[PDB]
Design a protein around this ligand. Sequence first.
Ligand SMILES: [Cu+]
Ligand SMILES: [Cu+]
Ligand SMILES: [Cu+]
Ligand SMILES: [Cu+]
Ligand SMILES: [Cu+]
Ligand SMILES: [Cu+]
Ligand SMILES: [Cu+]
Ligand SMILES: [Cu+]
Ligand SMILES: [Cu+]
Lengths: 336, 336, 335
Amino acid sequence: ATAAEIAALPRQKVELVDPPFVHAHSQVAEGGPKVVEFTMVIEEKKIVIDDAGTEVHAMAFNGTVPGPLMVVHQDDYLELTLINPETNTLMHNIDFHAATGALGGGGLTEINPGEKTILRFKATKPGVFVYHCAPPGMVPWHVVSGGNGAIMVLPREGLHDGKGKALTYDKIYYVGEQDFYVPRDENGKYKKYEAPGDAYEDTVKVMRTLTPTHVVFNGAVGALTGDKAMTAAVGEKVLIVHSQANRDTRPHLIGGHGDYVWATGKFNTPPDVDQETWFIPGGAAGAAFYTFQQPGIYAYVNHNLIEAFELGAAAHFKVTGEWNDDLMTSVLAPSG
Amino acid sequence: ATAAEIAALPRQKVELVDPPFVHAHSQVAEGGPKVVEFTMVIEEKKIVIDDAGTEVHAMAFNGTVPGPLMVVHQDDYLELTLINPETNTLMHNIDFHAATGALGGGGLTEINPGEKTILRFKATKPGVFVYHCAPPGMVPWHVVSGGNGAIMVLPREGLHDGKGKALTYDKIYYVGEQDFYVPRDENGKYKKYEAPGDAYEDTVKVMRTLTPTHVVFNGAVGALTGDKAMTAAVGEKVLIVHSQANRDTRPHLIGGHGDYVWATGKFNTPPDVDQETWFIPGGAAGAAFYTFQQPGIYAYVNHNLIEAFELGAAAHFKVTGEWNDDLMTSVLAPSG
Amino acid sequence: TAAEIAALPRQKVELVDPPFVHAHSQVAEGGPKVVEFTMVIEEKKIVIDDAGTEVHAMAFNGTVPGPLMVVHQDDYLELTLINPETNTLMHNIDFHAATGALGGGGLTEINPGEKTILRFKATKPGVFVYHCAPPGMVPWHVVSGGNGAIMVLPREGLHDGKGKALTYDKIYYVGEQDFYVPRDENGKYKKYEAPGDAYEDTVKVMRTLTPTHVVFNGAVGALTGDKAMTAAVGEKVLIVHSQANRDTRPHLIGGHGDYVWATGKFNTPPDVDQETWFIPGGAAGAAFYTFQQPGIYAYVNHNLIEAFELGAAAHFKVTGEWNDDLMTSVLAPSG
Ligand SMILES: [Cu+]
Ligand SMILES: [Cu+]
Ligand SMILES: [Cu+]
Ligand SMILES: [Cu+]
Ligand SMILES: [Cu+]
Ligand SMILES: [Cu+]
Ligand SMILES: [Cu+]
Ligand SMILES: [Cu+]
Ligand SMILES: [Cu+]
């Protein structure tokens, strides 16, 4: 399309919602290509990531870790207004893995505090894709400070399986998985800082060990458990988008499966089926489609169980409905 | 299916065999759906995991690390009797990745010492699947103490390749791979403990490093070597089921290939072909099919070669038969 | 038959250093050939970073990684492997592409002052690791750089899932190396007189499973600056990537993998529209991309700590015209 042609396209302004929720959208595309507009402010904020009061200087797209999921369709234009507020201390930018050229938008979106930019890219490829901050000289530091999220580029005709049967989700959740590298003192205590810059040297030392101190969902230990558990009902079709901008993960729905899993996150690559545990490399997002069959609490985990139950990479689903004794039954309950 | 229909189904009681062997089964299902019955006693026991005599307090399904492979067909019911003897000190349970609901069975199988339980589940999806102990609050500790195994749910029609050709193995082996985290003293020598509980806090410390001290097949360094080497012959078709309940692995047959590899372990997902090295994420089982073409010794390894040759993740095959100079020949043997 | 093999054409090929690849045709020309290669194993000190950090490398053909060898399915690869009397160690070679004798390693154990010639039939199409593998010292030889890759092209060249021909304009080979360099008490990398002096200290670092360096083409920044890879808008590029010991996750920052044989095997259909692909330790993968935008791209292991802190970052410098349909700055950074 020409510049004049793009300028003629319908503009639709989208209002983002916080992970793990996803803003309103249509699975099948509404008419021809549109310029879908989003705005996010990059917020620098202290976050507490565990019950010990451990702090991280987070870089939060739209105020969250991870930043929110943006949903467009293949061949829409994603037009992001990105804003760096005056109260911030650092330059920030954005690399969209979905985009083509200028380091994913990174080379065109470098904003100092008090600056804004507007980037437009054509979403030519269907899938779930990571985005992250990537300032030259400080790339992994910003990323492991929570400066990442994802987008979903839906096929204009919605999702399908390998064979062409439509796959339509009733619910969609976005899990952003985060590896943190929090410096400790000589007593094994996590250190605190009064400015993001103050933690830099200490953090880089920990980063180089390639061993995170915490691995969490939605920015904290227990962020997606208890009250903040994701919800479903027996018979509901759920899509779980999962991203990790820096480090590998192996998602697993304990009590469930991934009926269809785009493990690479790309919708033109046919999904794997009947998955127990899938694998998403650092720097990617994946998506799993499941229909719930049993009510109760599920644990959705990074299935390195040390990472899940020692380091924080565990979420819950709360599922309502009738128990199915055909699928599973206790023939003899625990007894002498 | 109703309770009355299931009650009407035939029962078979299977005798489990120790890994790497697999109990007598048929690849193609004989008859309609059965209720397949297994019994396992969990043993808390001291095991030696290397030639130095390093010991671990293991949690051992059926007394072995890994626990034995259970084999059923799709839409069979698996009915496990699980026994926690009174000589044990901890509660145990079981999560079948093959199963649907109650945390894979974990929520219905919490047994204290002196207790037993019977769990039935419908095997709705064909593939190889991990099972493991998963007691709330102590999940990874039990798993990395050896408390894991696998099952195989064969399609009723046996195995096929991606494209409708039947694949029939002559023999099957199950390689359970285990990451162990053994505390060291101030001179780097492995510590021993009187009771399982004594080791807990030191072991958690090593676990948090995400660096296993040992990575072994069938419970110990070199367990599948010497007169315990796996065997085949030229022309023989071998299925190799491989599981890792906690940590990623990258299986490789040195001198051979994976002709068909269900790297995700799920038989409705078409296998990769002509593989050098496949990838099995932590919390999953995979399976490779190979037809041996050359006689001699092969090493079957996790192809992080440090993990293979320093940490313990190497097995051998001894293969009998005639050498094929077409496939490979020494034109000029090592000479001055 | 014996005569049929004996009668097949023999052809000598000259190797070139990574990231470049020797002359080859994508579509096989004629029937099966015996393609002849020669490599001299060089034990040599190499510098791997900007602080002058040294490794006693084992370098097939004098390079880390060793060079890419290219043949076609059902060709034979016939390698003459030479271990100079000036070397101190025995070496051999395991071809993951080959069948038997531990990939060739059991037939190629050559002491200093020896050579050997190995022939194998390249029965399966794909990119495959090769590495040194002396019994009992396998990982030490591999993490000292003694590894490379080969490509076994389908006789009919590459195809997509629908069997449409994929023809590259150029090919690069990125060999990724995990190094495990000992440090003294003050955190300074140690140096050693002979390779064997470093053995015990090196194995200690190896057991932490934590590399000190993760590099492309044998050194931090080897494929950046005046040594960036190059392309033009519209140009079709195959990037072959190997890691003989440790997982990696390649990502073309600014680009994609249009077709990615993540397993490296050409009979396994490629994944498409890839953001970041995954290559397990002990394998090679291949990605096909058609550049759409000019500029600098970063080609990385997308554990960004490995990429930017440990060395796993390369560049592409791409010429041609910007495409505003694909991407445009609507409002440039402004106060
Ligand atoms: Cu940034
Ligand atoms: Cu940032
Ligand atoms: Cu990225
Ligand atoms: Cu247990
Ligand atoms: Cu347990
Ligand atoms: Cu599990
Ligand atoms: Cu060597
Ligand atoms: Cu050696
Ligand atoms: Cu190898």
